[PDB]
Amino acid sequence: PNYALKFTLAGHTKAVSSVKFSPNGEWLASSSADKLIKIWGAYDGKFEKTISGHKLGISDVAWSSDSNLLVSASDDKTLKIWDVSSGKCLKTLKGHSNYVFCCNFNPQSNLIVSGSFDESVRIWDVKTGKCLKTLPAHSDPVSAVHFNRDGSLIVSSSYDGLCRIWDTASGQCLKTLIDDDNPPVSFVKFSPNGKYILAATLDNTLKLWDYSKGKCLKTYTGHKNEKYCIFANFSVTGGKWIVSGSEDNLVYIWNLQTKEIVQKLQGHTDVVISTACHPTENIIASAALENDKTIKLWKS
Protein backbone atom coordinates (compact mmCIF):
# COMPACT_ATOMS: atom_id res chain seq x y z
CA PRO A 1 0.00 0.00 0.00
CA ASN A 2 1.00 3.65 -0.25
CA TYR A 3 -0.70 5.44 2.62
CA ALA A 4 0.04 9.16 2.64
CA LEU A 5 -0.88 11.75 5.27
CA LYS A 6 -3.93 13.74 4.19
CA PHE A 7 -5.26 15.42 7.34
CA THR A 8 -4.32 16.01 10.98
CA LEU A 9 -7.17 16.48 13.45
CA ALA A 10 -6.41 18.74 16.41
CA GLY A 11 -8.89 19.37 19.20
CA HIS A 12 -8.42 17.07 22.17
CA THR A 13 -6.60 18.70 25.09
CA LYS A 14 -5.12 15.45 26.40
CA ALA A 15 -4.00 12.09 25.05
CA VAL A 16 -6.37 10.54 22.52
CA SER A 17 -7.39 7.03 23.60
CA SER A 18 -9.32 5.56 20.68
CA VAL A 19 -10.60 6.30 17.18
CA LYS A 20 -13.29 4.41 15.24
CA PHE A 21 -14.92 4.90 11.84
CA SER A 22 -18.72 4.73 11.73
CA PRO A 23 -19.97 1.66 9.82
CA ASN A 24 -21.59 3.88 7.18
CA GLY A 25 -18.18 5.45 6.55
CA GLU A 26 -19.32 9.02 7.14
CA TRP A 27 -17.66 9.73 10.46
CA LEU A 28 -14.71 9.17 12.75
CA ALA A 29 -15.33 9.17 16.50
CA SER A 30 -12.52 9.76 18.98
CA SER A 31 -12.28 9.46 22.76
CA SER A 32 -9.69 11.05 25.02
CA ALA A 33 -8.25 11.37 28.50
CA ASP A 34 -9.78 14.86 28.33
CA LYS A 35 -13.17 13.24 29.09
CA LEU A 36 -14.55 14.09 25.66
CA ILE A 37 -15.74 12.32 22.55
CA LYS A 38 -15.32 14.14 19.24
CA ILE A 39 -16.83 13.46 15.82
CA TRP A 40 -15.00 14.27 12.58
CA GLY A 41 -15.73 13.90 8.88
CA ALA A 42 -14.20 10.62 7.69
CA TYR A 43 -13.14 11.93 4.27
CA ASP A 44 -12.21 15.57 4.92
CA GLY A 45 -11.29 15.29 8.59
CA LYS A 46 -13.59 18.26 9.16
CA PHE A 47 -14.49 18.64 12.83
CA GLU A 48 -18.17 17.89 13.40
CA LYS A 49 -19.06 18.00 17.10
CA THR A 50 -18.05 17.31 20.71
CA ILE A 51 -19.99 14.99 23.04
CA SER A 52 -19.48 15.51 26.78
CA GLY A 53 -20.75 13.98 30.00
CA HIS A 54 -18.14 11.65 31.47
CA LYS A 55 -16.57 12.78 34.75
CA LEU A 56 -13.14 11.27 34.08
CA GLY A 57 -10.98 10.14 31.17
CA ILE A 58 -12.37 7.85 28.48
CA SER A 59 -10.51 4.74 27.31
CA ASP A 60 -12.74 3.53 24.48
CA VAL A 61 -15.68 4.49 22.27
CA ALA A 62 -17.55 2.30 19.79
CA TRP A 63 -20.27 2.63 17.15
CA SER A 64 -23.53 0.73 16.87
CA SER A 65 -23.82 -1.11 13.55
CA ASP A 66 -26.29 1.41 12.11
CA SER A 67 -23.99 4.34 12.99
CA ASN A 68 -26.68 5.97 15.14
CA LEU A 69 -25.24 5.32 18.59
CA LEU A 70 -21.94 5.36 20.43
CA VAL A 71 -20.96 3.68 23.67
CA SER A 72 -18.00 4.91 25.72
CA ALA A 73 -16.02 3.42 28.62
CA SER A 74 -14.61 5.72 31.29
CA ASP A 75 -12.53 5.84 34.45
CA ASP A 76 -15.65 7.25 36.13
CA LYS A 77 -16.66 3.57 36.21
CA THR A 78 -19.55 4.00 33.81
CA LEU A 79 -20.30 3.46 30.17
CA LYS A 80 -22.56 5.90 28.37
CA ILE A 81 -24.78 5.24 25.37
CA TRP A 82 -25.08 8.28 23.13
CA ASP A 83 -27.39 9.30 20.31
CA VAL A 84 -24.89 10.76 17.86
CA SER A 85 -27.25 13.05 15.95
CA SER A 86 -28.60 14.80 19.06
CA GLY A 87 -25.57 14.36 21.30
CA LYS A 88 -27.87 13.05 24.04
CA CYS A 89 -26.73 10.58 26.67
CA LEU A 90 -29.48 7.96 26.41
CA LYS A 91 -28.22 5.79 29.26
CA THR A 92 -25.43 5.67 31.80
CA LEU A 93 -24.47 2.07 32.57
CA LYS A 94 -23.51 1.60 36.20
CA GLY A 95 -22.35 -1.66 37.71
CA HIS A 96 -18.60 -2.03 37.32
CA SER A 97 -16.71 -1.45 40.56
CA ASN A 98 -13.61 -0.04 38.88
CA TYR A 99 -12.56 1.76 35.68
CA VAL A 100 -14.33 0.65 32.50
CA PHE A 101 -11.65 0.15 29.84
CA CYS A 102 -13.21 -1.36 26.74
CA CYS A 103 -16.61 -1.66 25.09
CA ASN A 104 -18.48 -2.78 21.99
CA PHE A 105 -22.01 -3.28 20.70
CA ASN A 106 -22.98 -6.72 19.43
CA PRO A 107 -23.96 -7.03 15.72
CA GLN A 108 -27.63 -6.33 16.48
CA SER A 109 -26.63 -3.38 18.63
CA ASN A 110 -29.17 -4.56 21.20
CA LEU A 111 -26.39 -5.51 23.63
CA ILE A 112 -23.18 -3.92 24.84
CA VAL A 113 -20.21 -5.79 26.26
CA SER A 114 -17.73 -4.08 28.58
CA GLY A 115 -14.42 -4.93 30.24
CA SER A 116 -13.19 -3.36 33.47
CA PHE A 117 -10.27 -3.02 35.85
CA ASP A 118 -12.59 -4.83 38.26
CA GLU A 119 -11.57 -7.95 36.28
CA SER A 120 -15.08 -8.66 35.02
CA VAL A 121 -16.91 -8.52 31.71
CA ARG A 122 -20.48 -7.22 31.74
CA ILE A 123 -23.26 -7.61 29.17
CA TRP A 124 -25.85 -4.84 29.05
CA ASP A 125 -29.22 -4.34 27.40
CA VAL A 126 -28.99 -1.26 25.17
CA LYS A 127 -32.65 -0.20 25.29
CA THR A 128 -33.10 -0.44 29.07
CA GLY A 129 -29.49 0.14 30.06
CA LYS A 130 -29.68 -2.71 32.58
CA CYS A 131 -26.88 -5.19 33.17
CA LEU A 132 -27.98 -8.66 32.07
CA LYS A 133 -24.91 -10.67 33.06
CA THR A 134 -21.63 -10.24 34.90
CA LEU A 135 -18.84 -12.66 34.04
CA PRO A 136 -16.02 -13.29 36.57
CA ALA A 137 -13.82 -13.42 33.49
CA HIS A 138 -10.26 -12.66 34.55
CA SER A 139 -7.85 -12.16 37.45
CA ASP A 140 -6.48 -8.81 36.25
CA PRO A 141 -7.84 -5.81 34.29
CA VAL A 142 -9.78 -6.64 31.12
CA SER A 143 -8.14 -4.90 28.16
CA ALA A 144 -10.58 -5.66 25.33
CA VAL A 145 -13.98 -7.21 24.61
CA HIS A 146 -15.54 -7.98 21.22
CA PHE A 147 -18.55 -9.93 19.88
CA ASN A 148 -18.15 -12.39 17.03
CA ARG A 149 -19.96 -12.14 13.68
CA ASP A 150 -23.41 -13.26 14.90
CA GLY A 151 -23.02 -12.11 18.50
CA SER A 152 -23.19 -15.61 19.98
CA LEU A 153 -19.66 -15.33 21.37
CA ILE A 154 -17.61 -12.75 23.21
CA VAL A 155 -13.82 -12.70 23.28
CA SER A 156 -12.02 -10.94 26.13
CA SER A 157 -8.36 -10.25 26.86
CA SER A 158 -6.61 -9.41 30.10
CA TYR A 159 -3.39 -8.42 31.79
CA ASP A 160 -3.64 -11.88 33.37
CA GLY A 161 -2.17 -13.18 30.12
CA LEU A 162 -5.33 -14.82 28.88
CA CYS A 163 -7.77 -14.59 26.02
CA ARG A 164 -11.15 -16.13 26.79
CA ILE A 165 -14.18 -16.90 24.68
CA TRP A 166 -17.60 -16.73 26.31
CA ASP A 167 -21.02 -17.92 25.27
CA THR A 168 -23.14 -14.77 25.24
CA ALA A 169 -26.34 -16.56 26.27
CA SER A 170 -25.03 -18.77 29.08
CA GLY A 171 -21.95 -16.82 30.14
CA GLN A 172 -19.92 -20.02 30.27
CA CYS A 173 -16.22 -19.93 29.46
CA LEU A 174 -15.90 -21.93 26.25
CA LYS A 175 -12.17 -21.51 25.73
CA THR A 176 -8.96 -20.04 27.11
CA LEU A 177 -6.17 -19.18 24.69
CA ILE A 178 -2.53 -18.60 25.63
CA ASP A 179 0.78 -19.44 23.95
CA ASP A 180 4.15 -20.62 25.28
CA ASP A 181 4.67 -17.42 27.30
CA ASN A 182 2.32 -15.43 29.58
CA PRO A 183 2.65 -11.72 28.74
CA PRO A 184 -0.34 -9.44 29.36
CA VAL A 185 -2.84 -9.57 26.49
CA SER A 186 -3.49 -5.92 25.64
CA PHE A 187 -6.03 -6.23 22.84
CA VAL A 188 -8.19 -8.78 21.05
CA LYS A 189 -10.91 -8.89 18.42
CA PHE A 190 -12.56 -11.29 15.98
CA SER A 191 -11.69 -11.13 12.29
CA PRO A 192 -14.29 -9.79 9.81
CA ASN A 193 -15.28 -13.34 8.82
CA GLY A 194 -15.40 -14.38 12.47
CA LYS A 195 -13.07 -17.36 12.01
CA TYR A 196 -10.07 -15.85 13.75
CA ILE A 197 -9.05 -13.65 16.64
CA LEU A 198 -6.27 -11.08 16.47
CA ALA A 199 -4.54 -10.62 19.81
CA ALA A 200 -1.85 -8.21 20.96
CA THR A 201 0.49 -9.02 23.84
CA LEU A 202 2.87 -6.68 25.66
CA ASP A 203 5.92 -8.46 24.29
CA ASN A 204 5.86 -6.59 20.97
CA THR A 205 3.70 -9.21 19.29
CA LEU A 206 0.42 -9.57 17.41
CA LYS A 207 -1.01 -13.02 16.73
CA LEU A 208 -3.80 -14.39 14.55
CA TRP A 209 -5.52 -17.40 16.14
CA ASP A 210 -7.93 -19.94 14.72
CA TYR A 211 -9.94 -19.98 17.94
CA SER A 212 -11.93 -23.04 16.85
CA LYS A 213 -8.74 -25.12 16.65
CA GLY A 214 -7.08 -23.05 19.36
CA LYS A 215 -3.96 -22.64 17.24
CA CYS A 216 -1.82 -19.62 16.39
CA LEU A 217 -1.72 -19.25 12.60
CA LYS A 218 0.29 -16.05 12.16
CA THR A 219 2.59 -13.84 14.21
CA TYR A 220 3.28 -10.18 13.37
CA THR A 221 6.38 -8.53 14.78
CA GLY A 222 8.63 -5.54 14.17
CA HIS A 223 6.82 -2.86 16.17
CA LYS A 224 7.14 -1.81 19.81
CA ASN A 225 4.40 -2.65 22.29
CA GLU A 226 5.30 -3.36 25.92
CA LYS A 227 3.39 -0.71 27.86
CA TYR A 228 0.11 0.42 26.33
CA CYS A 229 -3.07 -1.28 25.17
CA ILE A 230 -2.79 -0.50 21.47
CA PHE A 231 -5.62 -1.43 19.09
CA ALA A 232 -5.04 -3.55 15.98
CA ASN A 233 -7.11 -3.82 12.79
CA PHE A 234 -7.84 -5.94 9.75
CA SER A 235 -7.61 -3.70 6.67
CA VAL A 236 -9.77 -5.18 3.91
CA THR A 237 -10.71 -2.42 1.45
CA GLY A 238 -7.59 -2.97 -0.64
CA GLY A 239 -4.89 -5.48 0.16
CA LYS A 240 -5.48 -7.65 3.23
CA TRP A 241 -3.32 -6.10 5.95
CA ILE A 242 -2.93 -5.99 9.71
CA VAL A 243 -2.61 -2.44 11.08
CA SER A 244 -1.42 -1.27 14.48
CA GLY A 245 0.02 1.64 16.37
CA SER A 246 3.43 1.34 18.02
CA GLU A 247 5.37 2.78 20.94
CA ASP A 248 8.00 4.16 18.55
CA ASN A 249 5.35 6.64 17.33
CA LEU A 250 4.70 4.86 14.03
CA VAL A 251 1.79 3.05 12.40
CA TYR A 252 2.75 -0.43 11.20
CA ILE A 253 1.12 -2.28 8.32
CA TRP A 254 1.75 -5.99 7.68
CA ASN A 255 0.74 -8.34 4.89
CA LEU A 256 -1.76 -10.58 6.70
CA GLN A 257 -0.65 -13.75 4.92
CA THR A 258 3.11 -13.24 4.56
CA LYS A 259 3.51 -11.37 7.86
CA GLU A 260 5.98 -9.00 6.21
CA ILE A 261 5.90 -5.30 7.09
CA VAL A 262 4.69 -3.43 4.01
CA GLN A 263 4.68 0.14 5.33
CA LYS A 264 5.35 2.32 8.37
CA LEU A 265 3.60 5.68 8.75
CA GLN A 266 5.66 8.45 10.34
CA GLY A 267 4.32 11.75 11.67
CA HIS A 268 3.07 11.39 15.23
CA THR A 269 5.22 12.75 18.07
CA ASP A 270 4.14 10.22 20.68
CA VAL A 271 2.87 6.65 21.03
CA VAL A 272 0.21 5.70 18.48
CA ILE A 273 -2.41 4.15 20.77
CA SER A 274 -5.19 3.55 18.28
CA THR A 275 -5.79 3.00 14.58
CA ALA A 276 -8.95 2.38 12.57
CA CYS A 277 -9.60 1.36 8.97
CA HIS A 278 -12.35 2.94 6.88
CA PRO A 279 -15.08 0.44 5.88
CA THR A 280 -15.03 1.19 2.14
CA GLU A 281 -12.10 3.46 1.26
CA ASN A 282 -8.38 2.86 1.77
CA ILE A 283 -8.23 5.28 4.69
CA ILE A 284 -6.54 4.79 8.04
CA ALA A 285 -7.07 6.91 11.14
CA SER A 286 -4.37 6.99 13.83
CA ALA A 287 -4.31 8.65 17.25
CA ALA A 288 -1.49 9.47 19.65
CA LEU A 289 -0.86 10.04 23.35
CA GLU A 290 -0.23 13.06 25.61
CA ASN A 291 2.81 14.59 23.87
CA ASP A 292 0.98 14.57 20.53
CA LYS A 293 -2.81 14.82 21.12
CA THR A 294 -3.73 14.55 17.45
CA ILE A 295 -5.49 12.20 15.08
CA LYS A 296 -4.18 11.66 11.57
CA LEU A 297 -5.96 10.46 8.43
CA TRP A 298 -3.94 8.58 5.82
CA LYS A 299 -5.08 7.49 2.36
CA SER A 300 -3.69 4.93 -0.09
Binding site: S17, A33, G57, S59, P141, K227, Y228
Partner: peptide, 6 residues
Protein backbone atom coordinates in the same frame (compact mmCIF):
# COMPACT_ATOMS: atom_id res chain seq x y z
CA UNK B 1 -7.27 5.28 31.55
CA UNK B 2 -5.69 3.81 28.41
CA UNK B 3 -3.34 6.79 28.09
CA UNK B 4 -1.63 5.69 31.32
CA UNK B 5 0.55 2.63 31.92
CA UNK B 6 -0.81 -0.09 34.22
Amino acid sequence: ARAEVH
